[PDB]
Design an enzyme around this catalytic site. Structure first.
Site, PDB file in Angstrom:
ATOM      1  N   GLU A   1       0.827  -1.207   0.000  1.00 54.33           N
ATOM      2  CA  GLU A   1       0.000   0.000   0.000  1.00 54.33           C
ATOM      3  C   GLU A   1       0.865   1.262   0.000  1.00 54.33           C
ATOM      4  O   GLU A   1       0.852   2.057   0.939  1.00 54.33           O
ATOM      5  CB  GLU A   1      -0.976   0.006   1.182  1.00 54.33           C
ATOM      6  CG  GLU A   1      -2.158  -0.937   1.045  1.00 54.33           C
ATOM      7  CD  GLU A   1      -3.253  -0.384   0.158  1.00 54.33           C
ATOM      8  OE1 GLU A   1      -3.078   0.726  -0.386  1.00 54.33           O
ATOM      9  OE2 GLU A   1      -4.294  -1.057   0.009  1.00 54.33           O
ATOM     10  N   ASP A   2       1.629   1.422  -1.077  1.00 53.26           N
ATOM     11  CA  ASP A   2       2.361   2.657  -1.350  1.00 53.26           C
ATOM     12  C   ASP A   2       3.356   2.991  -0.243  1.00 53.26           C
ATOM     13  O   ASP A   2       3.398   4.110   0.262  1.00 53.26           O
ATOM     14  CB  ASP A   2       1.395   3.821  -1.573  1.00 53.26           C
ATOM     15  CG  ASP A   2       0.959   3.948  -3.013  1.00 53.26           C
ATOM     16  OD1 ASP A   2       1.819   3.822  -3.909  1.00 53.26           O
ATOM     17  OD2 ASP A   2      -0.245   4.176  -3.250  1.00 53.26           O
ATOM     18  N   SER A   3       4.174   2.017   0.126  1.00 54.06           N
ATOM     19  CA  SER A   3       5.284   2.254   1.032  1.00 54.06           C
ATOM     20  C   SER A   3       6.589   1.870   0.352  1.00 54.06           C
ATOM     21  O   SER A   3       6.608   1.241  -0.707  1.00 54.06           O
ATOM     22  CB  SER A   3       5.114   1.489   2.344  1.00 54.06           C
ATOM     23  OG  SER A   3       4.292   2.215   3.236  1.00 54.06           O
TER      24      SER A   3
END
Ligand SMILES: [Mg+2]
Ligand SMILES: [Zn+2]
Ligand SMILES: [Zn+2]
Ligand SMILES: [Zn+2]
Ligand SMILES: [Zn+2]
Lengths: 66, 255, 34, 528, 98, 98, 115, 521, 44, 39
Positions: H204-206
């Site tokens: 999730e967008d890390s």
RNA sequence: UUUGGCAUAGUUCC
């Protein structure tokens, strides 16, 4: 600002190669040939010299406080 | 239920490079040695800086950070030294650190390059690797000045990456994909490894169901601090001391 | 005297001359001067 | 005036009685942490040392509380105040005299927040009750709010600069309320649509499909590791499927150990055809679809979004309804840990090799596009020669536009189908689409074959200039290119007019996103 | 004082009548990056109310080809109402038609 | 003397107009600074271009449910002398008369 | 602000024990070893050496959290053999292999240079 | 038109429009019209010739320039409503040539169609392979990246300033960045990015970041903050004494000099005194300025002067180096934003056959739904450029740069053509079954850090009018418990928790009331 | 107390209750001089 | 061709006497339902 | 160990 001492990715010392790289370029070398001559073998090390922007030259223009 | 019988062969040995082949060893042991090359090999590096005068164009933490990454020749005295947390002195004594001094002033009309050539140590065996070009520290205009005192402790690469003694550790096993540890969607697009033993037409070795990874190929390149043979030996001794201390603690706990 | 298939450098020479002559904030300077 | 003081928002009633700023609250960035449980939250040591909870002294804890007071406000596992029975406060942030440190039952000690404390975690806006749930505190080194990944769906939270709020209940009564009412495992199935509100999210979900394929055979050491990551494991290693000439387990044989209790379920994979259920091989399923779970064992089938997802009757929903929150929590955690540590072996990626098609497919796509453009040209010629006849209930412009849009949609869909059916079994777009992790067949079609038509306000691109779309077209041009049909894919790139038309198309989406939010919030407030 | 105040606050008008004075002119220069500085110095503004739900002036009209950037716009309450010049765009300075 | 007028940086009436990069460095000014902003009480101010409807042209629009069918306005100004605008409308009543 | 110092990943503090032995009550002849301030560099060798033993039925390791430095090793062995003996034998065999490897590498260096 | 092209009577700024159908000629000399230059096509051939090109390319020592090009009648300024009577061609050597006749009456030509993009959108490489919302997001995030913002930052006392240690110019750059001077004052670093799902900390967008790379100066920066104070009774800069001044706090005054100002080079931790000022209460009141809580910086510069009126004036600057933690925000040039998830040392990151561990690992799930293929093409072109030695060209509309050509060029250096590379697991040493896509992409460190966003409260300061907690992280304020939150708690049914949040945790109070009249007594 | 002038780079003694002027150059901006206190930097 | 979504929800919640797109679906009884003539 | 407020602008997240 000024060329980093180590290559970020692997740690090979590239901080002693900027003057030699500029001299090789001034002596009519392509960038690939200069990087090959300096011993920069892998692209992680090569980008450290290819993408460097030397701003300390601009910063030296302004007179010091004292 | 016993140990292995590893064998070695050194393909190439120069001043900054060792290529060797470990055989009859388990992948876990080979990879543990590979990890120990990077992390747990003690090295001398600067770890305490006190800047008397800094009129340059880089701030004090910038200069100190650059100083920390200059490698110092710790070929022979890294074993003699003690950890500063393990020493009887108050802060620093010659038995646990090496002191450096830098004092440069520019009084000319030409830009002056402050390099690692100017770092001066009290002990003649711990000097920057560019003191038998030079690692640039900072450039000085006319009237600008730098002066400091620095101390070089002992440590390894788990704590900070300035004590990492290597440049690039190439590790590779099974150059031809006989064990099918990696699966190629198209095997013919992939360049053959340097150690491949195949013809110009065949791309993958035939499958070997009853095989295990053996014959690991190494290439340890040194960053100038230690020489690339003592990096390997200190890793074998360094890993061996970790296991011995574990056995001592287990024996106390069992009894 | 046409410039055929050598255009990918001629157009950028022209654009470089434009931005050497004028700049990027010429609107503000010209408006205030006027 | 006083009416202005009482009038609206920021006005006394609606801004200080129906909602007001509170104590014991914190707010910082959230980052992922797959090693936590469903109902756990990672808290930095600074926030915990700053927030306090008042614990009443009894003979069961007087020694522990006295040691906390001895540690004092400096050391983190310490305390900040001592509250006497009379109510007078004693400070502990500075150096106090030894007399006040005396503790007797009935006192209160305001210790720092520690592990196991219950807090309420919220992300604004708060739309449904699954946006304020109770979590258990765990203290971690760095300074972000670590939280699990299956809990992303209830909050609608991604980890790109987001922040969330922490509220610490201060009494045993409210702590027991939150523990028995609003804990995360107790809110797995929502009452809005009687479906599980949280499920596997896109990375365990892109990997459980690969794990549950038929080909996955696991070595003895890999089985040892994966079982080492199982928290609800009996302790007995099951017999391998393949016993000779080398012991090999299977991915289903370990997901069976993950699945709890005796759960009976029958789902269907997302690529299950329409002939297997009818013709022969109904119960043999050549492609390994038709998930079957009998007695808590994955007998057959491939697990995907339609089995582990947030839909009605899924495997997680059955697990909840049959076993309870306390076992569904372990179900989630075990699935995530086992699949992640196996994924450390298989790996996953996405690249140009996964976004590039074959020469035959390129020829098919170009042929289809040329045929569609020719058909549009023919329709325009018939309209100009007045030979086009209007459809009943429609104007001449309306029927011409309907025919043109229908032709172009058929072209786009046909090229999309060709691009889909020309994929490979190793393609990572297919991996992330079939398993339901993230993406869609329309996205694959736009990447490979054709971006498609751009529309403004539901119609084709309008005539902004005098009777033409751009200064590069002649006047009165109704071709596919003039009104904004992008023939190229994202891999090939867009010509400048298509670039500008695509920007015009995306502006509408940005505007709708920025517009709908306030009206939706106002509608929800009025309903409440 | 009049010029200094109008430039300092941004309320384009007299101090006594800063009610109908249009605020939002004369912002304080952005200095986070050189690109931020340049894109601040080359910036437009549509005085349409930022809360207006009718979003026809917020769209990307066909006539912005080569005059205004099709991409660079803020997101939120001012999407499509703050714009930036294209690279080679120029704005006339004015003359008299004698 | 009737007052002091703020000066835009790098403009024709600034002290940095026409200077070379060496002089700019001597004055501790960045040669890369684009200029085009005012310095008001230390802070740096930037004027934002404000859109407005073109003047001295006849525009014919229509209103949704107003009394008139078609309207036409001519926002009139005189060479930036004074009397900013005077929008005269020439409307036309709808056909839905009772 | 909340940054742990770098030395906390390999230095035992006041009170911490290096290794603690616990039994597993689910299955007979099972035992869990918890090692503080260690990582995969030791866990992997010990696991792979335990698997070579024919009297070891289970042998694994795991790191419960990457931000907290601790290693857990679980080994179950056949009766008439104890997991503590299996662990100690594994460590002894690893030490013998490393010593032999160091000897052979040193002789190979000697052969390579001046030879 | 002839007179305007000669530049004799009518300035080049004036526009002329002929409405052929409605029989009207409109000439504008107005100010505020927006116009852009265009090339002129006379019959079917550009009036721009090789002689013009050569005289332009000898621009130095020749006094031939854009004005001399305009005066020759070669280019022209076209405003918006003159563009409605013109026929444009996007590319000369492609649209003027003989074809199946579309238009044979072209009246102008575009210089280059990539000049339709603004300053911030001229830095995106391959914007025509992206999605329009992604281009918009990058246009937004280009104003937040940290690099050297101006060359004379050492004499500027700016309230907040952020400068990167080692900026690098992109290895894949647009042709129109030389005019934006992104080569001279860049903001970002070329990082070896691998697109893989490694340990689940990049979901999730890390972003997973190499800690050994960070220890070597990777994405490190400085933070400068300035404080000001003037002595406007009688405010005086002086060193206060505990047992002579009325107002006082629990801070340390021992850092100050005789006149009440800290000398540069003095490390000051949070909640210290920088400038000591005292008001003579009609016997002295302390109005000293304090560091914003928890800065831990070093005093960098102190400036003493006189203000407009004549009161003494002082500005003090404090610096603090910011090492990238696990909450900091990073983004590439394609609208892909994310926060650091966890940092691994070099020994733990996956490695290639040659010991090249990635600097950054990003999740593969960010690509399929966002359709930022410019990201992948930039990665491939950078991997080609770092080996070849050139700097790749990614100007938007080229037709001479294909993925196929890039892959063929990359295959000549010993790598897989499509960019993949066989990686080994870090912990175990075993090959990863799926080959990973890895190459040098140009990443940016955004302004949003975590040390400037973390905030907590437990019984702090309280407002005056309502006796509720203050507002603002700088004032140790609380977090608002809004109507949506209280509705959520109503839906939960936690009546006691709701009453605690709305009454006891916030302002509690007691009053007396009469039993006869409901009026406070 | 010694302040360094920002134009002629000449340090001059200025005490409290004193206009901040520079001798021999007539400037009005003065900078404090670097402290004699010693501060220790790790080289990380 | 009707209104759906947020505007429709707004209209249904705050009922107005003038909906944006009023409609009236009509069903036929006998042979008018099948044969197009009476339809 | 004590507490300023009004306005405007920009930015982050749905
Ligand atoms: Mg988000
Ligand atoms: Zn390198
Ligand atoms: Zn010592
Ligand atoms: Zn009464
Ligand atoms: Zn002076």
């Amino acid at each position: 600002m000024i060329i980093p001492v180590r290559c970020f990715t692997c740690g090979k010392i590239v901080g002693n190669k900027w003057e030699a790289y500029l001299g090789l370029l001034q002596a009519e070398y392509t960038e690939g040939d200069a990087l090959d001559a300096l011993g920069l073998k892998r692209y992680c090390c090569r980008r450290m010299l290819l993408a460097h922007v030397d701003l300390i030259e601009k910063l030296l223009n302004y007179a010091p406080l004292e | 239920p016993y140990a292995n019988q590893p064998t070695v062969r050194i393909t190439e040995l120069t001043d900054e490079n060792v290529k060797f082949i470990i055989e009859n060893t388990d992948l876990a042991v080979a990879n543990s040695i590979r990890r120990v090359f990077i992390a747990e090999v003690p090295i001398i590096a600067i770890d305490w800086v006190q800047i008397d005068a800094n009129s340059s164009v880089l701030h004090d933490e910038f200069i100190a950070h650059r100083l920390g990454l200059i490698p110092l020749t710790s070929d022979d005295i890294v074993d003699k030294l003690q950890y500063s947390r393990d020493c009887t002195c108050e802060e620093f004594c010659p038995e646990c650190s090496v002191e450096f001094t830098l004092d440069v002033r520019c009084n000319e009309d030409q830009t002056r390059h402050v390099t690692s050539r100017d770092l001066i140590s009290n002990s003649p065996r711990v000097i920057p690797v560019t003191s038998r070009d030079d690692i640039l520290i900072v450039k000085l205009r006319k009237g600008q000045e730098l002066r400091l005192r620095a101390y070089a402790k002992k440590g390894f690469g788990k704590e900070h990456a300035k004590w990492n003694p290597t440049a690039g550790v190439a590790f590779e096993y099974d150059p031809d994909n006989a064990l099918r540890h990696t699966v190629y969607p198209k095997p013919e697009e992939w360049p053959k490894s340097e150690y491949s033993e195949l013809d110009e037409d065949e791309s993958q070795a035939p499958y070997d169901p009853n095989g295990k990874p053996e014959r690991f190929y190494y290439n340890v390149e040194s960053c100038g601090s230690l020489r690339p043979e003592t990096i390997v030996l200190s890793a074998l001794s360094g890993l061996k001391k970790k296991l011995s201390d574990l056995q001592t603690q287990l024996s106390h706990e069992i009894q | 005297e046409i410039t055929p298939d050598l255009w990918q450098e001629a157009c950028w020479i022209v654009i470089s001359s434009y931005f050497d002559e004028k700049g990027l904030v010429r609107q503000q300077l010209d408006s205030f001067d006027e | 005036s006083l009416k202005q003081r009482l009038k609206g928002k920021e006005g006394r009633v609606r801004g200080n009685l129906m909602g007001k700023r509170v104590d014991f609250s914190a707010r910082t960035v959230i980052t992922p942490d797959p090693n936590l449980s469903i109902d756990q939250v990672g808290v930095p040591r600074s926030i915990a040392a700053n927030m306090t909870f008042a614990e009443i002294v009894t003979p069961f804890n007087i020694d522990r509380l006295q040691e906390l007071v001895r540690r004092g406000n400096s050391q983190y596992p310490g305390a900040k105040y001592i509250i006497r029975d009379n109510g007078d406060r004693i400070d502990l942030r500075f150096h106090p005299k030894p007399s006040d440190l005396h503790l007797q039952t009935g006192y209160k000690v305001e210790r720092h927040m520690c592990d196991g404390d219950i807090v309420i975690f919220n992300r604004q806006p708060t739309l449904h009750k699954m946006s304020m749930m109770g979590h258990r505190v765990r203290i971690l080194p760095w300074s972000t709010f670590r939280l699990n990944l299956s809990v992303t769906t209830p909050y609608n939270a991604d980890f790109d600069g987001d922040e969330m709020n922490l509220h610490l209940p201060q009494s045993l009564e409210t702590r027991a309320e939150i523990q028995e009412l609003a804990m995360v495992p107790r809110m797995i199935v929502t009452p809005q649509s009687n479906r599980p509100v949280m499920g596997i999210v896109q990375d365990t979900l892109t990997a459980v499909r690969k794990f549950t394929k038929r080909d996955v055979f696991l070595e003895r050491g890999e089985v040892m590791n994966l079982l080492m990551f199982l928290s609800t494991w009996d302790g007995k290693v099951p017999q391998p499927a393949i016993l000779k000439p080398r012991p090999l387990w299977t991915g289903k044989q370990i997901f069976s150990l993950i699945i709890p209790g005796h759960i009976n379920c029958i789902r269907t994979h997302s690529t299950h055809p329409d002939d297997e259920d009818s013709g022969p091989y109904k119960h043999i399923s050549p492609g390994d679809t038709k998930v079957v779970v009998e007695n808590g064992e994955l007998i057959m089938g491939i697990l995907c979004k339609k089995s582990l997802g947030t839909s009605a009757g899924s495997l997680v929903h059955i697990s909840y309804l049959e076993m309870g929150h306390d076992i569904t929590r372990l179900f989630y955690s075990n699935i995530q840990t086992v699949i992640n540590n196996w994924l450390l072996i298989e790996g996953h990626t996405i690249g140009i090799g996964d976004s590039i098609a074959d020469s035959k497919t390129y020829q098919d796509i170009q042929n289809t596009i040329k045929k569609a453009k020719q058909d549009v040209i023919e329709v325009i010629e018939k309209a100009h020669n007045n030979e086009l006849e209007p459809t009943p209930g429609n104007t001449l412009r309306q029927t011409f536009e309907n025919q043109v849009n229908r032709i172009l949609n058929d072209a786009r869909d046909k090229t999309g189908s060709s691009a889909q059916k020309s994929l490979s079994e190793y393609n990572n777009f297919k991996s992330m689409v079939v398993s339901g992790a993230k993406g869609s067949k329309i996205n694959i079609s736009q990447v490979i074959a054709v971006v498609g038509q751009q529309n403004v306000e539901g119609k084709r691109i309008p005539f902004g200039f005098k009777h033409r779309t751009l200064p590069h077209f002649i006047k009165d041009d109704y071709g596919p290119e003039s009104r904004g049909f992008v023939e190229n894919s994202y891999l090939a790139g867009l010509t400048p007019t298509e670039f500008f038309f695509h920007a015009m198309g995306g502006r509408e989406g940005l505007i709708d996103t920025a517009v709908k939010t306030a009206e939706t919030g106002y509608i929800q407030r009025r309903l409440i | 004082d009049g010029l200094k105040y109008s430039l300092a606050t941004g309320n384009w008008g007299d101090q006594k009548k800063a009610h109908q004075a249009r605020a939002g002119v004369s912002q304080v220069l952005n200095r986070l990056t050189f690109a931020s500085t340049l894109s601040h110095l080359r910036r437009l503004n549509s005085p349409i109310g930022r809360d207006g739900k009718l979003a026809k002036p917020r769209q990307l009209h066909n006539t912005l080809w080569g005059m205004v950037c099709p991409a660079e716009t803020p997101e939120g309450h001012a999407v499509g109402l703050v714009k930036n010049l294209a690279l080679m765009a120029y704005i006339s300075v004015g003359s008299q038609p004698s | 003397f009737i007052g002091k007028i703020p000066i835009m940086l790098r403009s024709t009436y600034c002290l940095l107009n026409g200077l070379t990069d060496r002089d700019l460095c001597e004055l501790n000014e960045c040669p890369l600074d684009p200029g085009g902003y005012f310095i008001i009480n230390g802070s740096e101010k930037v004027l934002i271009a404000q859109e407005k409807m073109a003047t001295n042209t006849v525009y014919v629009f229509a209103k949704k449910d107003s009394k008139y069918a078609y309207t036409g306005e001519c926002r009139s100004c005189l060479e930036n002398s004074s009397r900013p605008t005077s929008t005269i409308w020439v409307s036309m009543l709808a056909r839905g008369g009772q | 602000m909340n940054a742990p110092p770098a030395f906390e990943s390999f230095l035992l503090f006041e009170g911490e024990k290096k290794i603690t032995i616990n039994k597993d009550t689910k299955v007979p002849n099972a035992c869990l070893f918890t090692i503080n301030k260690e990582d995969h560099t030791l866990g992997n060798i010990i696991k792979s050496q335990l698997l070579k033993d024919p009297q070891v039925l289970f042998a694994g390791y795991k790191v419960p959290h990457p931000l907290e430095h601790k290693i857990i090793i679980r080994v179950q062995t056949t009766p008439d053999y104890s997991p503590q003996e299996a662990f100690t034998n594994a460590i002894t065999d690893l030490i013998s292999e490393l010593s032999l490897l160091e000897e052979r590498f040193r002789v190979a260096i000697k052969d390579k240079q001046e030879g | 038109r002839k007179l305007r092209r000669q530049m004799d009577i009518i300035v080049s700024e004036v526009s002329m429009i002929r409405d052929i159908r409605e029989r009207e000629i409109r000439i504008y000399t107005d100010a505020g019209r927006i116009c852009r230059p265009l090339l002129i096509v006379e019959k079917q051939k550009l009036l721009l010739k090789k002689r013009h090109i050569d005289q332009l390319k000898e621009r130095e020592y020749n006094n031939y320039s854009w004005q001399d090009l305009v005066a020759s009648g070669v280019v022209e300024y076209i405003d918006t409503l003159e563009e409605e009577t013109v026929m444009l061609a996007m590319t000369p050597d492609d649209l003027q040539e003989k074809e199946v006749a579309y238009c044979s009456t072209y009246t102008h030509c575009e210089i280059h169609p990539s000049m339709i993009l603004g300053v911030c959108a001229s830095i995106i490489p391959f914007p025509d392979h992206n999605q329009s919302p992604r281009n918009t997001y990058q246009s937004a995030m280009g104003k937040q990246a940290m690099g050297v913002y101006i060359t004379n930052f050492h004499v500027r006392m700016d309230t907040l300033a952020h400068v990167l240690y080692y900026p690098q110019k992109p290895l894949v750059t647009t042709r129109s960045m030389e005019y934006l001077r992104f080569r001279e004052l860049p903001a970002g670093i070329n990082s070896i990015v691998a697109i893989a799902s490694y340990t689940g900390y990049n979901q999730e967008d890390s972003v997973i970041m190499n800690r050994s790379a960070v220890d070597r100066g990777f994405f490190r920066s400085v933070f400068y903050r300035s404080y000001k104070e003037q002595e406007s009774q009688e405010e005086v800069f002086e060193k206060p004494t505990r047992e002579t001044c009325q107002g006082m706090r629990h801070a340390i005054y021992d850092k100050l000099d005789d006149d009440g100002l800290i000398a540069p080079g003095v490390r000051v931790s949070g909640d210290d005194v920088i400038i000591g000022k005292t008001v003579t209460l009609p016997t002295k009141r302390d109005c000293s300025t304090f560091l914003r809580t928890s800065e831990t910086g070093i005093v960098d510069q102190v400036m003493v002067t006189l203000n407009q009126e004549g009161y003494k004036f002082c500005k003090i600057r404090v610096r603090s180096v910011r090492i990238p933690q696990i909450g900091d925000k990073f983004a590439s040039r394609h609208g892909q934003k994310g926060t650091c998830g966890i940092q691994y040392r070099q020994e733990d990151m996956p490695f290639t056959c040659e010991g090249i561990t990635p600097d950054i690992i990003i999740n593969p799930h960010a690509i399929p739904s966002r359709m930022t293929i410019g990201h992948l093409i930039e990665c491939l072109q950078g991997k080609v450029s770092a080996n070849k030695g050139e700097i790749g060209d990614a100007t938007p509309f080229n037709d001479a740069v294909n993925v196929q050509k890039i892959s063929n060029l990359l295959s000549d250096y010993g790598y897989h053509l499509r960019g993949n590379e066989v990686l080994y697991n870090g912990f175990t040493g075993r090959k990863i079954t799926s080959q990973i896509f890895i190459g040098p992409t140009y990443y940016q460190r955004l302004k949003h850090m975590v040390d400037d966003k973390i905030h907590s409260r437990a019984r702090g300061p309280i407002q005056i009018l309502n006796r509720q907690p203050m507002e603002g992280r700088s004032r140790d304020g609380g977090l608002r418990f809004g109507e949506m939150e209280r509705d959520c708690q109503i839906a939960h049914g936690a009546a006691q928790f709701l009453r605690e949040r709305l009454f006891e945790a916030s302002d509690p109070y007691q009053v007396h009331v009469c039993n006869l009249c409901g009026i406070m007594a | 107390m010694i302040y360094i002038c920002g134009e002629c780079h000449t340090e001059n003694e200025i005490k409290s209750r004193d206009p901040i002027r520079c001798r021999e150059c007539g400037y009005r901006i003065m900078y404090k001089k670097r402290t004699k206190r010693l501060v220790v930097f790790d080289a990380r | 061709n009707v209104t759906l979504g947020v505007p429709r929800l707004k209209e249904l919640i705050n009922i107005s006497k003038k909906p944006k797109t009023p409609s009236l679906t009509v069903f036929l009884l006998g042979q008018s339902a099948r044969d197009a003539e009476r339809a």
